[PDB]
């Protein structure tokens, strides 16, 4: 079978929905781990060296900072757009501080479903090119899976459009929901920007608290992957309750709520819409 490596559980789950059991799939960053700052283990190095096809997020998720993915593919002697492919190719990127320069792209593209669909399209394209015997199967699965994501995307947009505008603000610890904000029309506010060295200082908390006191936002949210003490402080200082824990950069463990890219997104979209309608 085609040997495929995915960098994280979101990309691996989308890949499973296109390829089923036709491939031999290995995922590097385990469920619930950090897909930006990860140290590959010997098994990841071996599997990447042997792979026919490698999928990564791109847009600086795994190539910034310690650039773990760049080192991995260079040591594995794998070539860009031959052996490895960025599943975000074609997304309408968002830049940090609104400054268009290569390396300033915000990586969190999958938090809108139109981009999950683009991820799936790129995965199906490259599986078909490397394994043409199953091309019809990949194309069929792509159509079925993108229809499922598209339905959730339209349903979710209808929910958010109904919410009184004064309540529509997605508040999280890190600014990881800009793609969600762009697609669903819910502006973002957060404690620290992506790539800040200091996470949750008194100055950052105070800055967000002062912004939120001037708003009518009824609920706050907190990521399951971050220390919740900064947002709990923001919640107490503003008297705005934390409605729910939400997913950011991993799906849930198998058998739990949110254990696929689709179910992770359905949980997030439904809980954010519920909390903001309060």
Swiss-Prot record:
Coiled-coil stretches noted in the UniProt entry, renumbered to this chain: none
Gene Ontology terms for molecular function: metal ion binding
Effect in UniProt of substituting residue 89 to E: In strain: NA-1064/97, NA-1383/97 and NA-1508/92
InterPro entries reported in the protein's UniProt record: AdhesinB (IPR006129), Bact_metal-bind_prot9 (IPR050492), Lipoprotein_PsaA-like (IPR006128), ZnuA-like (IPR006127)
Effect annotated for changing residue 176 to C: In strain: NA-1383/97
GO biological process, one term: cell adhesion
Entry keyword set: Cell membrane, Lipoprotein, Manganese, Membrane, Metal-binding, Palmitate, Signal, Transport
Record's subcellular location: Cell membrane
Principal location class: membrane
Keyword match Transmembrane helix: no
Membrane topology: Lipid-anchor
Effect of mutating residue 254 to E: In strain: NA-1508/92
Effect of residue 99 to K: In strain: NA-1064/97 and NA-1508/92
Pfam families documented for this protein: ZnuA
Family: Belongs to the bacterial solute-binding protein 9 family. Lipoprotein receptor antigen (Lrai) subfamily.
Miscellaneous comment text of the record: Zn(2+) can bind to PsaA but cannot be transported by the permease into the cytoplasm. At high Zn(2+) concentrations, Zn(2+) binding competes for Mn(2+) transport impairing growth and rendering S.pneumoniae hypersensitive to oxidative and polymorphonuclear leukocyte-mediated killing.
PANTHER family according to UniProt: HIGH-AFFINITY ZINC UPTAKE SYSTEM PROTEIN ZNUA-RELATED (PTHR42953), METAL-BINDING PROTEIN HI_0362-RELATED (PTHR42953:SF1)
Name recorded for this polypeptide: Manganese ABC transporter substrate-binding lipoprotein PsaA
Organism: Streptococcus pneumoniae serotype 4 (strain ATCC BAA-334 / TIGR4)
């Amino acid at each position: 079978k085609l040997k495929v490596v995915a960098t994280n559980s979101i990309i691996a789950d989308i890949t499973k929905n296109i390829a089923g059991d036709k491939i031999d799939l290995h995922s590097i960053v385990p469920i619930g781990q950090d897909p930006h700052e990860y140290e590959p283990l010997p098994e990841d190095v071996k599997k990447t060296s042997e792979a026919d096809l490698i999928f990564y997020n791109g847009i600086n998720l795994e190539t910034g900072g310690n650039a773990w993915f760049t080192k991995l593919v260079e040591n594995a002697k794998k070539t860009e757009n031959k052996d490895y492919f960025a599943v975000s190719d074609g997304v309408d990127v968002i830049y940090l501080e609104g400054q268009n320069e290569k390396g300033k792209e915000d990586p969190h593209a999958w938090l809108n479903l139109e981009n999950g669909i683009i991820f799936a399209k790129n995965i199906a394209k490259q599986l078909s090119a490397k394994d043409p015997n199953n091309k019809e199967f990949y194309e069929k699965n792509l159509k079925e899976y993108t229809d499922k994501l598209d339905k959730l995307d339209k349903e979710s947009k209808d929910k958010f459009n109904k919410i009184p505008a004064e309540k529509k603000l997605i508040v999280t610890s890190q600014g990881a929901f800009k793609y969600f904000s762009k697609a669903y029309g819910v502006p973002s506010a957060y404690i620290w920007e992506i790539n800040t060295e200091e996470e949750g200082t008194p100055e950052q908390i105070k800055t967000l608290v002062e912004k939120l006191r001037q708003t009518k936002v009824p609920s706050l949210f907190v990521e399951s992957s971050v220390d919740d003490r900064p947002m709990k402080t923001v919640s107490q200082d503003t008297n705005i309750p934390i409605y729910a824990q939400i997913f950011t950069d991993s799906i849930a463990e198998q058998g739990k709520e949110g254990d696929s890219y689709y179910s992770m997104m359905k949980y997030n979209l439904d809980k954010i819409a519920e909390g903001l309608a309060k």
